[PDB]
Amino acid sequence: MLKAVILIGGPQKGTRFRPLSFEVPKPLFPVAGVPMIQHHIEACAQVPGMQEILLIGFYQPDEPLTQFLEAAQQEFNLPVRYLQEFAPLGTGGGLYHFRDQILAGSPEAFFVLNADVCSDFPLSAMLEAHRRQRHPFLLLGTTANRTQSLNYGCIVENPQTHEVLHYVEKPSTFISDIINCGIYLFSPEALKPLRDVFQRNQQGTIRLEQDVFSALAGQGQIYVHLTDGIWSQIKSAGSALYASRLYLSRYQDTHPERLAKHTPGGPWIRGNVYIHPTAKVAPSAVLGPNVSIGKGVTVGEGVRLRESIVLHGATLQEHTCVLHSIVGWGSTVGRWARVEGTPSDPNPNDPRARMDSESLFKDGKLLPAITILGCRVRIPAEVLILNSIVLPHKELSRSFTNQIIL
Amino acid sequence: MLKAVILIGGPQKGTRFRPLSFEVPKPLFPVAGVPMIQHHIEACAQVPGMQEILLIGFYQPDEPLTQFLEAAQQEFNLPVRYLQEFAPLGTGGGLYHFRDQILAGSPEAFFVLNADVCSDFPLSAMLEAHRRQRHPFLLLGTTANRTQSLNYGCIVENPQTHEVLHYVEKPSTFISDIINCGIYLFSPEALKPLRDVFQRNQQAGTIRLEQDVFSALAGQGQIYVHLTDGIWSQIKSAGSALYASRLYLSRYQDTHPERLAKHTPGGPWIRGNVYIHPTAKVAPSAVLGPNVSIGKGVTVGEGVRLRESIVLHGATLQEHTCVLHSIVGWGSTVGRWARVEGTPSDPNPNDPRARMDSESLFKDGKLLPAITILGCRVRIPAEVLILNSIVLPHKELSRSFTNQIIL
Amino acid sequence: MKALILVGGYGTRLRPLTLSTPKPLVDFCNKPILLHQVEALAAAGVDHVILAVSYMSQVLEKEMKAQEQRLGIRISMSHEEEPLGTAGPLALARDLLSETADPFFVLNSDVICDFPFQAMVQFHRHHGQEGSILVTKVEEPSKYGVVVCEADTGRIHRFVEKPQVFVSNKINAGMYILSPAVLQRIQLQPTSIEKEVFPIMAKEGQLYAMELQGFWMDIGQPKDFLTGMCLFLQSLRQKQPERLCSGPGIVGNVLVDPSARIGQNCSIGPNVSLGPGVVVEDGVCIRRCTVLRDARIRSHSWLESCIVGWRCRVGQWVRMENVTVLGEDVIVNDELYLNGASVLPHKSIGESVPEPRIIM
Ligand SMILES: Nc1nc2c(ncn2[C@@H]2O[C@H](COP(=O)(O)OP(=O)(O)O[C@H]3O[C@H](CO)[C@@H](O)[C@H](O)[C@@H]3O)[C@@H](O)[C@H]2O)c(=O)[nH]1
Ligand SMILES: Nc1nc2c(ncn2[C@@H]2O[C@H](COP(=O)(O)OP(=O)(O)OP(=O)(O)O)[C@@H](O)[C@H]2O)c(=O)[nH]1
Ligand SMILES: Nc1nc2c(ncn2[C@@H]2O[C@H](COP(=O)(O)OP(=O)(O)OP(=O)(O)O)[C@@H](O)[C@H]2O)c(=O)[nH]1
Secondary structure (H helix, E strand, C coil): CCCEEECCCCCCCHHHHHHHCCCCCHHHHHEEEECCCCHHHHHHHCCCEEEEEEEEEEECCCCCHHHHHHHHHHHCCCCCEEEEECCCCHHHHHHHCCHHHHHCCEEEEEEEEEEEEEEEECCHHHHHHHHCCCCCCCEEEECCCCCCHHHHCCCEEEEECCCCEEEEECCCCCCCCCCEEEEECCCCHHHHHHHHHHHHCCCCCCCHHHHCCCCCCCCCCCEECCCCCCCCCCCCCCCHHHHHHHHHCCCCCCCCCCCCCCCCCCCEECCCCEEECEEEEECCCEEEECECCCCCCCCCCCCCCEECCEEECCCCCCCCCCEEEEEEECCCEECCEEECCCCCCCCCCEEEEEECCCCCEEEEECCCCCECCCCCEEECCCCEEECEEEECCCCCCCEECEECCC | EEEEEECCCCCCCCCCCCCCCCCCCCCEEECEEHHHHHHHHHHHHHHCEEEEECCCCCCCCCHHHHHHHHHHHHHHHCEEEEECCCCCCCHHHHHCCCCCHHCCCCEEEEEECCEEECCCCCCHHHHHHHHHHHCCCEEEEEEEECCCHHHHEEEEEEECCCEEEEEECCCCCCCCCCCEEEEEECCCCCHHHHHHHHHHHHCCCCHEEEEEEEECCCCCCCCEECCCCCCCEEEEHHHHHHHHHHHCCCCCCCCCCCCCCCCCCCCCCEECEECCCCCEECCCCCEEEEEEEEEEEECCCCEEEEEECEECCCCCEEECEEEECCEEECCCCCCCCCCCEEECCCCCCCCCCCCCCCCCCCCEEEEECCCEEEEECEEEEECCEEECCCCCCCCEEECCEEECECC | CCEEEEECCCCCCHHHHHCCCCHHCCCCHCEEEEHHHHHHHHHCCCCCEEEECCHHHHHHHHHHHHHHHHCCCCEEEEECCCEEEECCCHHCCCCHHHHCCCEEEEEEEEECCCCCCHHHHHHHHHHHEEEEEEEECCCCCCCEEEEECCCCCCCCEEEECCCCCCCCEEEEEEEEECCCHHHHCCCCCCCHHHHHHHHHHHHHHEEEEEEECCEEEECHHHHHHHHHHHHHHHHHCCCCCCCCCCCCCCCEEEEEEEEEEEECCCCEEECEEEECCEEEEEEEEEEEEEEEECCCCCCCCCCEEECCCCCEECCCCCEEEEEEEEEECCCCCCEEEEECCECCCCECCCCCCCCEEEEC
């Protein structure tokens, strides 16, 4: 038997995902219709031998997290527990702090997944490689562009034994095309270096990449497993859109009943579109590629929706165009209003993609990105929101362009 | 018997041109050490015969609002009540909706005061002009620059009798250089035209006071002006509040000489006018430049240079930091050798009586360089420059930011 | 009288010129800035003047001991080994100005005016106080030391160097008449004459202001330098019209040295001064420019609002606009566009400069 540890963050790691995170926690943001960690729990309960799923984070258990945990426990036939760490303990410090609960029942190995990644999660093939080799650390790696790889944790390996010889968390200079994916397979022996790291701290917070992956690289403990299935990070509020698009593309294999079909008496559907059943979509509303509709969403007639997330309880009145946007919970977009953004994906194989920095401005100018509307934002009739971020509970009366509307 | 009505706004109507804060209500923001409406309440409770003080707004009753009401009631031994509207009723709709509460006790007159002004508040001078005149609407007006007069309520008066003949609220072309200060003396008959505006609509109860009652009743012998020479500013932006802080710390030299910070050469070096709370800990090596206001429980380390800044309560500035032109929010930490700097929004010093322009956070799609705002519980790391940035509340930074809005 | 010219040092505003020849010696309309001051002092009836040097006293002092025998007044010099600023040489020359119980001129080295020395000293003895300064009206008083002048007499009520609140509108013209009793008051430690001496003067009612007639400018920056030569050529158009060279192809006011030549088919546009020994080729259009000593401007160029220093070689088909200052002996290659280029001394430019930059 095995178990999974999904490292969800806490409220400080959700600061970068801020317009969206004001209402829900970041790991519960619905990416292609289901919350962000439900893709992880989906992929982990698909593995034969999964006993437990242990979320580690420093979120307080509010109503949405505990209701999600009970819903995941019923839907996925597993005990899904939430281990709240007493302090922000870094990446590996919460795995070392909870080692008695992780190793309870003596699992053969355990997965360690970052909650902010979108992946196909090739957990079975990682397990095949681990049961072949039996090493302390198995990392998942992807190939990136040489220019984009500097935004990520670079891995220099040995292409015959697949041993990580070098690891650097964000190098200024080129190191390697292999980037860490935030998916790991630890054996129980892997909790013995972390102990050492913690003991060296006494002369509690352990960063897994800077203190364990970069230290034991080349000593025989850390190994790679490569893929090139889908992979994305979700850091800012608008990388949720790229993650949603990748997931809606892989629903063509894993859940094709989530994807909506045209059915000539209904709304006109291009590309991959998720529509929740509670949503009412008018038959003249064409829903373009990579759209996901939340529950309780009333989409009026003639509404064009392309490359967007419309969250729960939102309302798009007649003849609206919503492109590359995230319409928040309960937001209302009046008739002939245009909410337009600019596509900006992380995409580590795109040589023109931005670094996904925390600074949204270059020199006073807001860089063109996804248009985020917070919850309860009333966009008036006949008005354009272009490349803007609107903070929650803001009733607007005016056209806004390249602005953060506080 | 006189009473006072302070029109405080509400959660959406604040519309912060560049935010002073995010989590405390805008009337309770400390300008020159004390909350923005406590200057109004001091000025009103100094007036003899003033019985009651009413705050009309549509803020929900949170805890800071209630504890400020109790603190003001205890400090001035006046009733200070908060009449909350069922909706945003505009500038005159809350006066018409609460006219039985306003006119209970039968006052001789009532002062209507905008919450977001910094004023000398010559309430006895307006009171004496009105006791000589006995007119329905008396307005305090100042003198504006010709270019900047278009942002305020402009007044064509008659200079012999001091009667408003024409009123435009926010013009596009110049009509006058007299501007409405936002301070009014109302007779108990001034509620009688407000009713008329309501009955023009009912043929709910929103009445813009300046656009419906002042713009349309001018020239009819009903509105009169009282021209003043003292300090006056509008407090809308963050730089507008730093300017109001400078004006009020100037006026503290002859109203509250105990409130300013003297040198005390065992203690911190004081340049200019500085307010320090008695509970704040300021290390003796820290030099505190002009127009600095320190809240309660603020810890200031050694060698801290504070110049033209508001440091709200609970904030900790560690050693060797430089905070200039900033509003360090409550509970915010600035670590060693960090520099939190903003750009001053100073009036045009070549021109007579330029008041202030309030920056609108974006000029033409570009972010404007202005005051640096740190939100509540913002952590600035050691050895980091924050320049012209707004850091949203509860955000631990890790690098130097320049001309950002860090969410 | 005595006359004290605090002559600046390191000349940081107006730097590409002062990197070779000091700011009292750079020729403003074909003779140096100090020379205008000292010829007007020799016409004023000042018996010997002293200048308070601190930087590059080799070339400066050799020029002063050249023209000491030409003006016929002893051009005495206060050397300093470190800069003392703006009130330090008041106290270094304490003995050399305390010898007579007579007032003395204190002149900024960079102000160019239509001076009224007779008006200033014989306005001064009408009130007999410790100091009487010259004031002028200006549109941006936040850059210069303002005053508050009362009606018909002119007592300085207040004095602040940067008003910042807009107290008033009149400013320091940069010329003062000081009495010897203010000498011993301040100390040799360097400070500012404006921050402390005059602001304690105004507390007594011993500072006075005389309103100027007009044409004041201080040439610290090259923009102020070119605005000042515009106003100086205007003063020459009003007063001495034959000094300006006007001819067939001359447009506006042009002041040419006799040694300078100009080709055919050229257009030497309004408010231009050509220094000595320059040679101007055929087909140029030079408007609002100063061209200093022995510089060359080759054929078919277009120069506007620019300073061409000593022994520069501006090539052919060369456009220069937007206060482009060239330092001493700069060679501009053919067909280059310089907008805003401050060019360091002994540089050869081989690329266009499309935005205002410093080239080093
Ligand atoms: N109760 C209530 N109060 C309100 C409402 N809306 C605004 N207020 C408060 O009423 C005052 C009026 O502010 P605004 O309506 O936003 O206008 P203004 O830009 O401040 O202009 C007014 O004051 C200026 C002086 O600063 C004047 O120049 C101008 O004529 C006008 O009187 C402010 O204190 C505001 O907080 C409301 O709906 N209900
Ligand atoms: N449980 C838990 N999880 C965390 C904590 N910190 C981070 N994580 C998770 O692990 C991931 C790592 O994020 P970061 O802490 O930013 O580290 P990084 O991805 O290596 O990038 P850097 O910021 O450059 O260090 C986060 O996206 C979270 O999913 C923590 O303190 N506790
Ligand atoms: N003799 C002398 N005069 C000085 C010195 N420093 C300043 N001055 C004078 O002080 C007055 C005001 O100085 P500025 O207007 O700034 O001119 P500057 O000294 O050339 O300096 P910058 O233009 O700023 O580089 C001028 O008349 C200078 O001539 C000095 O060190 N020695």
